[PDB]
């Protein structure tokens, strides 16, 4: 058998429908989006790991992710992203 | 007498076309041959995936486009419209390459 090929195409597609129900996305565009998601994930995870190592934290909490997002994202992207993350975490905690 | 565009018009039209388009500008097979020849020194009898060669061509084209943009900026800074090897050398030195 051939190895399973997991990806984020379905989730990116759902987000696209949420923001633009009408427009589509090409396969190469889907791959580029997956690459972008992987790159951002790696950057944020590495930043959080470095922050924890500096603070000798054995675990990565939402605060570390917030710090990484603030450090990496420039200007308004950091603020809106932080707001969205806080809203999501609050909603998760409420249930 | 037959029509003849003044110098500059064709160059600007080409600039507009190649900035508006996105297709590759380097021929594929000679680039593949060059890649294989360069790889021969590091190791002999290697194999290459087509996607790898395409990625190499994409990266090289992007790097050369950036270098030419920097060269054009340097040439314009010197009150000149013609890029010269000095422009490329200065751009590389400033970029630390």
């Amino acid at each position: 058998k051939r190895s399973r090929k997991e990806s984020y195409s379905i989730y990116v597609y759902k987000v696209l429908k949420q923001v633009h129900p009408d427009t589509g996305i090409s396969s190469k565009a889907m791959g580029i989006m997956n690459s972008f998601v992987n790159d951002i994930f790696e950057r944020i995870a590495g930043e959080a790991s470095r922050l924890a190592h500096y603070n000798k934290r054995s675990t990565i909490t939402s605060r570390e992710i917030q710090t990484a997002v603030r450090l990496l994202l420039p200007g308004e992207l950091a603020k809106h992203a932080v707001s969205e993350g806080t809203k999501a975490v609050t909603k998760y905690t409420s249930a | 007498k037959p029509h003849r565009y003044r110098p500059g018009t064709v160059a600007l039209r080409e600039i507009r076309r190649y900035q508006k388009s996105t297709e590759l500008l380097i021929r594929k097979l000679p680039f593949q041959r060059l890649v294989r020849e360069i790889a021969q020194d590091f190791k002999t009898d290697l194999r290459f995936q087509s996607s790898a060669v395409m990625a190499l061509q994409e990266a090289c084209e992007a790097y050369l486009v950036g270098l030419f943009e920097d060269t054009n900026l340097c040439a314009i800074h010197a009150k000149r419209v013609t890029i010269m090897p000095k422009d490329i050398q200065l751009a590389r030195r400033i970029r630390g390459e």
Binding site: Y8, Y11, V12, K14, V15, L16, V19, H20, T23, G24, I25, S26, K28, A29, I32, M33, F36, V37, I40, F41, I44, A45, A48, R57, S58, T59, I60, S62, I65, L73, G75, E76, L77, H80, A81, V82, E84, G85, T86, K87, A88, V89, K91, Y92, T93, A95 | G8, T9, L12, R16, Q19, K20, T22, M54, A55, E58, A59, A62, I76, V81
Partner: protein
């Protein structure tokens, strides 16, 4: 005991579309830290979803400007480079089958001369 309550995905609980569980698994397998918090995957997924939404919105706007409906790498490149913050975030990134922003320096533009006769030296 207590009878297993019906399962609800953490993505559904947080309201996000991206997979919280997959993000948590990736973080644990990535050796980024000895432990992974419960809220950290949620926060990371939310931020990724927001960034994806922003980029997709800008790309769709660019496509509409081009009278197209399916996003292609050209639309992504235009959206990323036109936006200042995204361009700074992805300044050193390269996109396959991309292009460049239409830009010609004013000096290179043809010299507008009030008197315009046949070309002579």
């Amino acid at each position: 005991g207590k009878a297993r309550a019906k399962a609800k995905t953490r993505s559904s609980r947080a309201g996000l579309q991206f997979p919280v569980g997959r993000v948590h698994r990736l973080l644990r397998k990535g050796n980024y830290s000895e432990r992974v918090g419960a809220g950290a995957p949620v926060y990371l997924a939310a931020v990724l979803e927001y960034l994806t939404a922003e980029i997709l919105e800008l790309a769709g706007n660019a496509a509409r400007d081009n009278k197209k409906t399916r996003i292609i790498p050209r639309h992504l490149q235009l959206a990323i480079r036109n936006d200042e913050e995204l361009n700074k975030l992805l300044g050193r990134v390269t996109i396959a089958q991309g292009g460049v922003l239409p830009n010609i320096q004013a000096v290179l533009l043809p010299k507008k001369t009030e008197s315009h006769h046949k070309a002579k030296g």
